[PDB]
């Protein structure tokens, strides 16, 4: 079990760690998050009390280094950093743990929610979507735009999700216009799965990361990416059976976790009605259809 220690908390802030959150008051003696489960990526995220504008945060994996958080009064935010001196870092964390200045990652033993939301998410792929190679962790916030959004403005600060566009030459084989537009199996299986992602695990990883950035930061371009990746599968008549069963589980846990009060802005009515009730896969997402119908029957 690993720790993300904090120098101090000089400004009042709501701190998120994965699906959990807690309020820290201005100058409260708060020195970290301990008992973080090894084996998963994690996200530590922030919303300042005085400017709820800009949720921001950091994706990280404690197996890759010793990370600490410290408030920068010039840039006005909590920054993740890496300490290369391991003994020094162990000594700092041990001191905070003895003075009981940390909150404990509050995982219930029965609870597989975080695993289920991050099953295919790998830090190495996060770092290719979020390019900042000098750090082992990745910063994301509410305003960052995607490569596709920028085509339709700073490249270094963009989310390099895989571009999906149903009315594009990449999606439509010359001579199969009607076929490929009405059944996207070519685009899913040859262009995207075989060609770009290489396997369905990497596809699901990007889909899961896009959902999590939409939910935790209200990142609009990530929400677009999540829905596009769902729609591409549901609009394909030919999908491997293991992928459909896994997609149903993925979406089930995403819909289960979504704040009930954000459903209006994080769920696209057109995509979900099309996917559950009109698409080729309308009968292939039993778990997802059942939770959607019981939790958000208004959207449908």
Partner 1 sequence: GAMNSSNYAELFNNDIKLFVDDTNVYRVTVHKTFEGNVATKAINGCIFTLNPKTGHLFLKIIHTSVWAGQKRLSQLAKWKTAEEVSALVRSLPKEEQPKQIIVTRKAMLDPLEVHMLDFPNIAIRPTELRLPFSAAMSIDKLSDVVMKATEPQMVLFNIYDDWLDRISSYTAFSRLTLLLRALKTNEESAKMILLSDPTITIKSYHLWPSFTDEQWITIESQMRDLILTEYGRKYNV
Ligand X SMILES: COc1cccc(CC(=O)O)c1
Q: What is the contact surface with ligand X in residues (CB under 6 A)?
A: 5-7, 68, 83, 89, 92
Cα–Cα distance for residue pair 118/89, rounded to 1 Å:
27
Residue 90 or 111 having the CB closest to ligand X = 90
For the CB of residue 22, give the shortest distance to ligand X in the complex, in Å: 18
167 binds, among ligand X, partner 1, none (CB under 5 to 8 A by kind): partner 1
Closer Cβ to partner 1, 53 or 168, answer by number: 168
Among 21, 95, 168, 278, binds partner 1 (CB under 8 A): 168
| Residue 89 contacts which entry, partner 1, ligand X, none (Cβ below 5-8 A, type-dependent) | ligand X
Sheet strand arrangement including 138-141: 20-24, 13-17, 42-48, 56-60, 138-141
CB 115 within 8 Å of CB 18:
no
State in angstroms the smallest separation of the CB of 4 from ligand X.
8
Q: 3-state DSSP call for residue 294?
A: helix
Size of the site for partner 1 (CB under 8 A): 7
Does residue 169 bind partner 1 (CB under 8 A)? yes
**Residue 178 binding partner per list partner 1, ligand X, none, with a CB distance cut-off of 5 to 8 Å that depends on partner kind:** partner 1
Residue 250's nearest CA partner among 295, 211, 296 is 211
Q: Detail the DSSP E strand segments found in the chain.
A: 2-5, 13-17, 20-24, 32-36, 42-48, 56-60, 67-72, 77-82, 103-104, 138-141
Q: Give the separation between CA 246 and CA 293, rounded to whole angstroms.
A: 19
Nearest to 56 by CA among 38, 72, 36, 33: 72
Nearest Cα neighbor of 27 from 12, 40, 37 is 12
| For partner 1, the closer CB: 43 or 172 | 172
Binding site partner of 181, from ligand X, partner 1, none, Cβ cut-off 5-8 A by kind: partner 1
- The β-bridge partners of 33 are 4, 103
> Is 279 within 8 Å of 234 (Cβ atoms)?
yes
Query: Which partner, partner 1, ligand X, none, binds residue 234 by CB below 5 to 8 Å per kind?
Result: none
186 by DSSP, 3-state: which?
helix
Strand-pair partners of 60? 42
Q: Does 181 bind partner 1 (CB under 8 A)?
A: yes
Stretch that binds partner 1, among 25-33, 53-61, 122-130, 166-174 (CB under 8 A): 166-174
177 belongs to the binding site for partner 1 (CB under 8 A):
yes
Given partner 1, ligand X, none, residue 5, with its beta carbon under 5 to 8 Å by kind, binds: ligand X
> 75, 124, 154, 167: which one contacts partner 1 (CB under 8 A)?
167
Q: Which does 177 bind (CB under 5 to 8 A by kind): ligand X, partner 1, none?
A: partner 1
Does 278 contact partner 1 by CB under 8 A?
Answer: no
- Binding site residues, partner 1, CB under 8 A: 167-169, 172, 177-178, 181
């Amino acid at each position: 079990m690993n720790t993300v220690p904090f120098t101090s908390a000089p400004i009042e802030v709501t701190i998120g760690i994965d699906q959990y959150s807690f309020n820290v008051k201005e100058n409260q003696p708060f020195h970290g998050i301990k008992d973080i489960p090894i084996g998963h990526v994690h996200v530590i995220h922030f919303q300042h009390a005085d400017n709820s504008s800009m949720r921001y945060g950091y994706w990280f994996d404690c197996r890759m280094g010793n990370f600490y958080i410290q408030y920068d009064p010039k840039d006005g935010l909590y920054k993740m950093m890496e300490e290369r001196d391991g003994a020094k870092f162990e000594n700092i964390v041990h001191n905070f743990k003895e003075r009981q200045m940390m909150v404990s990652y509050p995982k219930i033993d029965e609870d597989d929610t975080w695993y289920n939301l991050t099953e295919f998410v790998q830090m190495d792929k996060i770092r290719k979507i979020v390019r900042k190679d000098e750090n082992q962790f990745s910063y994301v916030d509410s305003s960052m735009t995607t490569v596709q959004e920028n085509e339709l403005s700073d490249p270094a600060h963009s989310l390099n999700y895989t571009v999906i566009n149903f009315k594009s030459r990449e999606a439509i084989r010359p001579g199969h216009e009607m076929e490929d537009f009405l059944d996207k199996s070519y685009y899913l299986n040859t262009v995207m799965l075989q060609g770009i992602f290489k396997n369905s695990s990497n596809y699901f990883g990007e889909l899961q990361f896009a959902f999590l950035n939409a939910m935790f930061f209200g990142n609009y371009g990530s929400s677009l990416q999540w829905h596009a990746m769902i729609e591409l599968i549901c609009s394909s008549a030919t999908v491997p059976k293991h992928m459909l069963d896994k997609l149903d589980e993925i979406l089930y846990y995403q819909i289960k976790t979504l704040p009930e009060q954000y459903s209006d802005i994080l769920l696209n009515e057109r995509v979900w009605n099309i996917c559950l009730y009109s698409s080729f896969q309308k009968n292939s997402l039993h778990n997802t259809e059942k939770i959607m119908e019981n939790k958000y029957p208004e959207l449908l």
